[PDB]
Swiss-Prot record, chain A:
Modified-residue entries (Phosphoserine), positions: S15
Subunit structure: Component of the small ribosomal subunit (SSU). Mature yeast ribosomes consist of a small (40S) and a large (60S) subunit. The 40S small subunit contains 1 molecule of ribosomal RNA (18S rRNA) and 33 different proteins (encoded by 57 genes). The large 60S subunit contains 3 rRNA molecules (25S, 5.8S and 5S rRNA) and 46 different proteins (encoded by 81 genes).
UniProt organism field: Saccharomyces cerevisiae (strain ATCC 204508 / S288c) (Baker's yeast)
Stretches for region Disordered: 1-34
Cysteine pairings via disulfide bonds: none
Keyword Ribosomal protein tagged: yes
Keyword Metal-binding part of the UniProt annotation: no
PANTHER family for the chain: 40S RIBOSOMAL PROTEIN S30/UBIQUITIN-LIKE PROTEIN FUBI, RIBOSOMAL PROTEIN S30, ISOFORM A
Gene giving rise to this polypeptide: RPS30A
Protein name according to UniProt: Small ribosomal subunit protein eS30A
Primary role: Component of the ribosome, a large ribonucleoprotein complex responsible for the synthesis of proteins in the cell. The small ribosomal subunit (SSU) binds messenger RNAs (mRNAs) and translates the encoded message by selecting cognate aminoacyl-transfer RNA (tRNA) molecules. The large subunit (LSU) contains the ribosomal catalytic site termed the peptidyl transferase center (PTC), which catalyzes the formation of peptide bonds, thereby polymerizing the amino acids delivered by tRNAs into a polypeptide chain.
UniProtKB/Swiss-Prot annotation, chain B:
Keyword RNA-binding: yes
Subunit structure, as described in the record: Component of the small ribosomal subunit (SSU). Mature yeast ribosomes consist of a small (40S) and a large (60S) subunit. The 40S small subunit contains 1 molecule of ribosomal RNA (18S rRNA) and 33 different proteins (encoded by 57 genes). The large 60S subunit contains 3 rRNA molecules (25S, 5.8S and 5S rRNA) and 46 different proteins (encoded by 81 genes). Interacts with snoRNA U3. uS11 interacts with MPP10. Component of the ribosomal small subunit (SSU) processome composed of at least 40 protein subunits and snoRNA U3.
Species assigned in the record: Saccharomyces cerevisiae (strain ATCC 204508 / S288c)
Keyword Repeat part of the UniProt annotation: no
Name the UniProt record assigns to this protein: Small ribosomal subunit protein uS4A
Span list, region Disordered: 159-185
Keyword annotations of the record: Cytoplasm, Isopeptide bond, Nucleus, Phosphoprotein, Ribonucleoprotein, Ribosomal protein, Ribosome biogenesis, RNA-binding, rRNA processing, rRNA-binding, Ubl conjugation
SMART domains for the chain: Ribosomal_S4, S4
From Swiss-Prot, chain C:
Pfam families per the UniProt record, alphabetical: Ribosomal_S24e
Localisation: Cytoplasm
Protein name per its UniProtKB record: Small ribosomal subunit protein eS24A
Described purpose of this protein according to its UniProt entry: Component of the ribosome, a large ribonucleoprotein complex responsible for the synthesis of proteins in the cell. The small ribosomal subunit (SSU) binds messenger RNAs (mRNAs) and translates the encoded message by selecting cognate aminoacyl-transfer RNA (tRNA) molecules. The large subunit (LSU) contains the ribosomal catalytic site termed the peptidyl transferase center (PTC), which catalyzes the formation of peptide bonds, thereby polymerizing the amino acids delivered by tRNAs into a polypeptide chain.
UniProt cross-references to SUPFAM superfamilies, sorted A to Z: Ribosomal proteins S24e, L23 and L15e (SSF54189)
Upper taxonomic lineage: Eukaryota, Fungi, Dikarya, Ascomycota, Saccharomycotina
Cross-link position per record: Glycyl lysine isopeptide (Lys-Gly) (interchain with G-Cter in ubiquitin): K20
UniProt modified residues of type N-acetylserine: S1
GO cellular component: cytosol; cytosolic small ribosomal subunit; mitochondrion
UniProtKB/Swiss-Prot annotation, chain D:
Protein name stated in the entry: Small ribosomal subunit protein uS12A
Subunit structure: Component of the small ribosomal subunit (SSU). Mature yeast ribosomes consist of a small (40S) and a large (60S) subunit. The 40S small subunit contains 1 molecule of ribosomal RNA (18S rRNA) and 33 different proteins (encoded by 57 genes). The large 60S subunit contains 3 rRNA molecules (25S, 5.8S and 5S rRNA) and 46 different proteins (encoded by 81 genes).
Disulfide bonds: none
Keywords: Cytoplasm, Hydroxylation, Isopeptide bond, Ribonucleoprotein, Ribosomal protein, Ubl conjugation
One Pfam family per UniProt: Ribosom_S12_S23
Length: 60, 185, 134, 144
RNA sequence: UAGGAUAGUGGCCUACCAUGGUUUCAACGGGUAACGGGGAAUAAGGGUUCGAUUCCGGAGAGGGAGCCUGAGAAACGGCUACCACAUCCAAGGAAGGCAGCAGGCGCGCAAAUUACCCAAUCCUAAUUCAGGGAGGUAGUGACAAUAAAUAACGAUACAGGGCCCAUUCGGGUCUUGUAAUUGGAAUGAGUACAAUGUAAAUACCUUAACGAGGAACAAUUGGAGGGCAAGUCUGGUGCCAGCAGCCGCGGUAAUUCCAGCUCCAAUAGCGUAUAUUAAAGUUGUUGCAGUUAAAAAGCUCGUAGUUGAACUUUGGGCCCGGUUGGCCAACGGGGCCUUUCCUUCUGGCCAGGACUUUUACUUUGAAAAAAUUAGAGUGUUCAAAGCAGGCGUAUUGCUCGAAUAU
């Protein structure tokens, strides 16, 4: 029922975020090879068995 | 005003998109058999579902129904011929068995890994798709070729396309022509 | 180019079209895709029947290569090959000149312009030549 | 038998009875009363193109205290005025008055979506140049 | 009833006469963002939604109407008139019909070339030849559907994990991998001789000569609180901006916003909107609920509707043909006899007569358009497909198919 909220602060956080750049990284393969890259990463040499398995831990 | 050209979907994505058990079981298949997609497993699951529903449709009849005898013997011989169905297990209650790994074992990729000749399922996949191995004299570059019984004794390299003779190959040709340039004339 | 092979399969004698007709299976190992001229030469010196009465077509090579299957005809004369073949193959072999005309729609437009003229039209041509005095 | 006839000659009672009781379904009612073609500010279509009149700031009721940036749009095929949300951090700097936008629904099939009172639609394309690509800076809004 | 009309039946029309005809088993009217069907989507069974659109049937050529010609039209790439548009004009007159092909304007969320050609499929004609925007070819085409590149294998190196052994140094070989050093092989993406393809080409299938080392020839789309696979990492913001299908985040240490890194899911695809199907036993015949959650009429009578007790040749005995499975039982079948019409005569299941309770149910079969679905065979390289194809004396030829089911 309120229809005239002020539009001044629009785009605030997007425009005042600090711009950083993407880091140049080596290319991860695509397709079949990438699934192979996942496969050893999960089943063959599964590294952290802290409790069970963590696909993305922090700085633990 | 023509005749229509028919087609069909050959796969069916599962109903729950994220089950940890199914993702683990399908990455295990994709790593043991060297696949690209999960669609390369969903296609095999589609084949199993159609074969298996047809088998149930025959099992619900009585024995010595002529449709049961004809379609059962036909489906059994088609499953035996590609080596999916074993030789002792030949009676239509064994095609209701017969998991996905039995079809995923008989592809040209895995059979090229087994019969020497490839030393890896990834090397087998790349060997197949790079205009190597032939079955008859026919070069096949389809890693889901699904070899038969009477053709698995014919998987070998091409009469063209080196590792079968017939030329060195362009990186070997260039490395020779740069070996034949600096040292000599 | 290794002594390659010709094979003629499925041969039917057609005395009512005055020809032999067959499938041509060509093994050409270590050679891409032989020719049509050279296949006509190597069939004319097998059927002993004068290459301008030998026709070949079809001929897509196998996947992987080394083999190509097409169709062939051998007529009882060049005089009957000039009466039972289509004109495009008789152009291909050099046995009829490629009779060029104008385009499709240029012929259609010329037909439509002739449809508006009744008679030979030379009376109309001289009558509109007479128009230039008013 | 508890509530329904069962005898073999009683299919007319069953037909007319289920045909009467189907009207309590919301979907069947709105599909056989033609709500889509008369009500529901589109034509029952999926997207619709319209022209921005003014920019609104709609206050989110109850929770999520914020000003959702919306626009008031007059549809071309109807002339119906319609409030439409302009989704992302920014993007009211990309819509301007008297442009043309393409509205889509919110995936709630009516029923103004989140904490927004009355706004049933979102803006997809302004001036033909696709607000997602305008907000990811891979496309440039035209001159006029 | 009689006449007219018609190609012909007929209230089709006319004259005279009669008062009938339909309807709660839904007539009649209304709506249809309704052409009908074969079919399509959805996959327990039952269903539910869709079918403008490749085939069949119908209808229309701007809206109506009228008609000529002909075997056939109420024809519109024929005519006539009226209405609505709309074009040329020397102002008098003339000509019109893209819901054919291409194209344009408009409309809208929404859809291609003013291209080549009769070579194939077939049609037309006085016809072997001519013609065919039917049709085919190509341009555009992420509407859908098929297949499946974006790398593979080493060795060395520190580090393991195994273990022969451990009194106590470590590695050496069976190697799984983390390696910012390295190594030669392999391929098509492209380009291109030629040949093939083709009516002529383009593309495909072949193939010389080029064409892989990271600056490539570099994979994206959506997400990381739960649902729901995947962070409590870092910087920014501070109920602002914004996110969020739902529940919920944001008010200074935000796992949810804006970014970086990492990870996840699908992948040449992925997201969003709307509609529909499953989910949904939330439409319930299968198969819902009705004391209190929504819902037993206040009560009885009562018509159509739906439903409606039991009873009439049961049993026993003989014989014959089988079809599975190990002389044998079982499974069904048929003829006799047990107080037991078989519709009945005529002269050979025929064929003249005389008549006979009627349905519902069910088995079997016919007659059943293709395509689509199901399905048999077949190595389109696989596959979607297609209906092919396979074999020899491959210098003169043999043959299986193109089932079946619903």
């Amino acid at each position: 029922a309120k229809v005239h909220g002020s539009l001044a602060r629009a785009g605030k956080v997007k425009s005042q975020t600090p711009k950083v750049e993407k880091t140049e990284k080596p290319k991860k393969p695509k397709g079949r090879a990438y699934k192979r890259l996942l496969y050893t990463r999960r089943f063959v040499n599964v590294t952290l068995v802290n409790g069970k398995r963590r696909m993305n831990p922090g700085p633990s | 005003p023509r005749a229509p050209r028919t087609y069909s979907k050959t796969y069916s994505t599962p109903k729950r998109p994220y089950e940890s058990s199914r993702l683990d079981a399908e990455l295990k298949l994709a790593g043991e058999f060297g696949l690209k997609n999960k669609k390369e497993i969903y296609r095999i699951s589609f084949q199993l579902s159609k074969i298996r529903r047809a088998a149930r449709d025959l099992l619900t009849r009585d024995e010595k129904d002529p449709k049961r005898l004809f379609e059962g013997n036909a489906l059994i011989r088609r499953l035996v011929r590609v080596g999916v169905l074993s030789e002792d297990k030949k009676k239509l209650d064994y095609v209701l068995a017969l998991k996905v790994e039995d079809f995923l074992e008989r592809r040209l990729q895995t059979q090229v890994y087994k019969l020497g000749l490839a030393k890896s399922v990834h090397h087998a996949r790349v060997l197949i798709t790079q205009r190597h191995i032939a079955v008859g004299k026919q070069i096949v570059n389809i890693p889901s070729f699904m070899v038969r019984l009477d053709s698995e004794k014919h998987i070998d390299f091409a009469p063209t396309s080196p590792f079968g003779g017939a030329r060195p190959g362009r990186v070997a040709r260039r490395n020779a022509a740069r070996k034949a340039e600096a040292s000599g004339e | 180019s290794d002594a390659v092979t010709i094979r003629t399969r499925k041969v039917i004698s057609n005395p009512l079209l005055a020809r032999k007709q067959f499938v041509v299976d060509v093994l050409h190992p270590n050679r891409a895709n032989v020719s049509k001229d050279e296949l006509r030469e190597k069939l004319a010196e097998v059927y002993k029947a004068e290459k301008d009465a030998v026709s070949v077509f079809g001929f897509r090579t196998q996947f992987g290569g080394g083999k190509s299957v097409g169709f062939g005809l051998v007529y009882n004369s060049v005089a009957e090959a000039k009466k039972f073949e289509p004109t495009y193959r008789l152009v291909r072999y050099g046995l009829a000149e490629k009779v060029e005309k104008a385009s499709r729609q240029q012929r259609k437009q010329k037909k439509n312009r002739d449809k508006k003229i009744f008679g030979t039209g030379k009376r109309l041509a001289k009558k509109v030549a007479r128009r230039n005095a008013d | 038998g508890k509530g329904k006839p069962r005898g073999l000659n009683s299919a007319r009672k069953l037909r007319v009875h289920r045909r009467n009781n189907r009207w309590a379904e919301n979907n069947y009612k709105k599909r056989l009363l033609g709500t889509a073609f008369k009500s529901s500010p589109f034509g029952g279509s999926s997207h619709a193109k319209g022209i921005v009149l003014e920019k609104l700031g709609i206050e989110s009721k109850q929770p999520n205290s914020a000003i959702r940036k919306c626009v008031r749009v007059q549809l071309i095929k109807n002339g119906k005025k319609v409030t439409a949300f302009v989704p992302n951090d920014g993007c009211l700097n990309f819509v301007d008055e008297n442009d043309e936008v393409l509205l889509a629904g919110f995936g709630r099939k009516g029923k103004a979506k989140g904490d927004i009172p009355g706004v049933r639609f979102k803006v997809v394309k302004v001036s033909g140049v696709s607000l997602l690509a305008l907000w990811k800076e891979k496309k440039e809004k035209p001159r006029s």
